Amino acid sequence: RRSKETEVFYELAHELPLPHSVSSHLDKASIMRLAISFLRTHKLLSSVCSMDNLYLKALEGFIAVVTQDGDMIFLSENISKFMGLTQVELTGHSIFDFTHPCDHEEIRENLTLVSTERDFFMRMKCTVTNRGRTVNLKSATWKVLHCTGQVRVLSCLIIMCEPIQHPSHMDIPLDSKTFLSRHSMDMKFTYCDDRILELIGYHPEELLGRSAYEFYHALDSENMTKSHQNLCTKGQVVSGQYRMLAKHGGYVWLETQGTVIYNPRNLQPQCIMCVNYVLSEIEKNDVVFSMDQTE
């Protein structure tokens, strides 16, 4: 009977790996999807292996495993923290139902096929506001997530999705070996902070108006173009490791986060703000690579 089913549904919800609290509020469709996915999940894991609150809190992102056809069969608990959307709300649904259509094709091909490794950026819906608060699903913003993992045998894609911290909104501490820069959309320097001098030897005045591409080691230029286009197309990007030519010979290793900055009043793309992570001291200090170094 209805009564008699409503009893076991509750029995099922509370024995879901969930708080009695949240377990208690599920409609029945969800209890299915969450239970199902828990078993689905449990089946992938035994295939791989043969204080979670810590792990969950050390994460700067959430974990997802997604089937070759797009179903999100598991999503780690702390995603709500990043996307607003909770584990319960999404589990068992199609990834494509929550990602920018302009990326669906891309996602599809990352879901598919013989290297197993996967690394890409994806725009996913976020309903938590910069600084705490929350919005409705219609009032969703697009959030870029950096995804890294492996495609693995029915296939699965097992990825980590990290948000890229917004330069105007920083929860997180910065050390010495980091400097800021601003660019036009073609990545020409439009600003560079005084720390660059100490870090690489350039004066901002020497960099202003100068295209970023001429300070890249050339072996890297093609690869950075990809970062640029990603940044533009999706709004944020993380570059690979790259060498930047230093004022007096040699180069430094870098990793850069870039964000397109918008005018909140006229909604124009105003500029690119870059957080540049310097990964080394100057290497091949002896070798002069470019004309600028002459100065």
Binding site: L39, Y55, S76, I172, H228, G240, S290
Partner: protein, 261 residues
């Protein structure tokens, strides 16, 4: 709705297919049962260790905790072994400074100061002196203090390479020029490629240059005699293409590959 009930069933069906004690059954039990055979079946049974396992799969990450005041490692997960080729025994009880590049020591010192969220990038040693780039994410938890963090990994002469402005001027050369043409980078930089070409070949070189620009983006190869540091005329093939700005499609520079023939 119609398909409402159908998908509960597909769910239900799915459930029994997946509850072995229910699945191994002669025929399919009812709604109320499967509902209470799954309950019993998980009341048997994400794993605590598994969340950790997924990280390794996904992010090639491993966990570690270090005392903040000293940097003493109060714990390292064993995943340091698959991640770093490093024994927990090599890692547990130690100092993070022992584990990073001497140049990451400073950067490391600033991360562990009394203050929150922490996050950084550094080079760590792996052993059988080799370093790898590791992204560290984590937070400060008292333990006078400890750092809870995850380190994860990242995804990745016959000739010499040059970049030019569209005029033929050298604006960038790799150290192999010395090997290829005997010149110090300084000796090539700032001078026109034309200035290094044999008179009888110079228009082809210019021809080449007018063409690769005009035939934007694409490669064109051209062969000419280059004057070594020792002045002897060297046969060379360079294949080159124009490089355009991804945003503006302005030509950033010409990229050349210059191969000793």
């Amino acid at each position: 709705e119609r398909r409402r009930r159908n998908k509960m069933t597909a769910y239900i069906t799915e459930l029994s297919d997946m509850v072995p004690t229910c699945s191994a059954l002669a025929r399919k039990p009812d709604k109320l049962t499967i509902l209470r055979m799954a309950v019993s079946h998980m009341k048997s049974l994400l794993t605590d260790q598994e969340l950790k396992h997924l990280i390794l799969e996904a992010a090639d990450g491993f966990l570690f905790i270090v005392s903040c005041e000293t940097g003493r490692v109060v714990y390292v997960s064993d995943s340091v072994t698959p991640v770093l080729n490093q024994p927990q025994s090599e890692w547990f009880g130690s100092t993070l400074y022992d584990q990073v590049h001497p140049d990451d020591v400073d950067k490391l010192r600033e991360q562990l100061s009394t203050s929150s969220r922490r996050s950084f990038i550094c080079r760590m040693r792996c052993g059988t002196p080799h370093f790898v780039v590791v992204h560290c994410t984590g937070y400060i938890k008292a333990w006078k203090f400890c750092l809870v963090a995850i380190g994860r990994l990242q995804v990745t002469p016959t000739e010499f390479i040059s970049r030019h402005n569209i005029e033929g001027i050298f604006t960038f050369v790799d150290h192999r020029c010395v090997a290829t043409v005997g010149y110090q980078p300084q000796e090539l930089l700032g001078k026109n490629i034309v200035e290094f070409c044999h008179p009888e070949d110079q228009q082809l070189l210019r021809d080449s240059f007018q063409q690769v620009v005009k035939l934007k983006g694409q490669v064109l190869s051209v062969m000419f005699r280059f004057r070594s540091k020792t002045r002897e005329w060297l046969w060379m093939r360079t294949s080159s293409f124009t490089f355009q700005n991804p945003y503006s499609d302005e030509i950033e520079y010409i990229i050349c590959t210059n191969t000793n023939v």
